[PDB]
C-alpha cells in the first residue's frame, strides 16, 4: 500500500467535502461504494478518515463521481 | 504502466505550467530531475508532452517541488 503525507490541507479538503456529500446523500456504505465504483472497504477507510490512503487523483475521482467539479488556481 | 485519461483540462493546465517553468529555469533535463528527485526519464516524458504517465498527484509533486502554490476550488 501507498500512504501519502504531502499536499495535506488540500488532500483534507478533498476529503472532507467528500465525507460530508456522502454522509447527507441517503446512500449506505454498499450504495455509495456502487455510486463510485470502488470497494466497500474502500468506502469504510474514507468515512473513517484513513487520509493516507488515498492519493489527491482517487480523491478527485471520486469527487466528480458524486457530481461536483474540482478547479484548480496555481500562484506563483 | 498507469496511464490516465480523466480530468484532462486539469491535468493538461498543471502539466503545461510545469513545462513552462521548466523550460525557462535555465536547468538542463538532469538538473530538472534532480530538483525534482526524479528520474531522467521521467522528465523527459514531461517536456515530450507525454500526459497520459502523469497522476495528479505527480504533477502536484513537481509543481510544489518548483515552488508554485495550487489551491483547489470544489463547486457544486
Known amino acids: 500500500i501507498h500512504?501519502?503525507?504531502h499536499h495535506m490541507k488540500m488532500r483534507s479538503q478533498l476529503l472532507?467535502?467528500?465525507q460530508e456529500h456522502l454522509?447527507?446523500?441517503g446512500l449506505t456504505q454498499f450504495?455509495?461504494?456502487e455510486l463510485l465504483g470502488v470497494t466497500q472497504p474502500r468506502v469504510?477507510?474514507?468515512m473513517?478518515?484513513?487520509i493516507d490512503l488515498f492519493s489527491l487523483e482517487s480523491?478527485?475521482?471520486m469527487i466528480t463521481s458524486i457530481g461536483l467539479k474540482v478547479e484548480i488556481n496555481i500562484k506563483d
Chains 1, 2 share one sequence.
Open 16 to 18: 472532507i467535502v467528500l
Open 44 to 46: 469504510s477507510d474514507l
Open 31 to 33: 450504495k455509495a461504494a
Open 48 to 50: 473513517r478518515g484513513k
Open 23 to 25: 454522509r447527507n446523500s
Open 3 to 5: 500512504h501519502h503525507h
Open 59 to 61: 480523491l478527485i475521482d
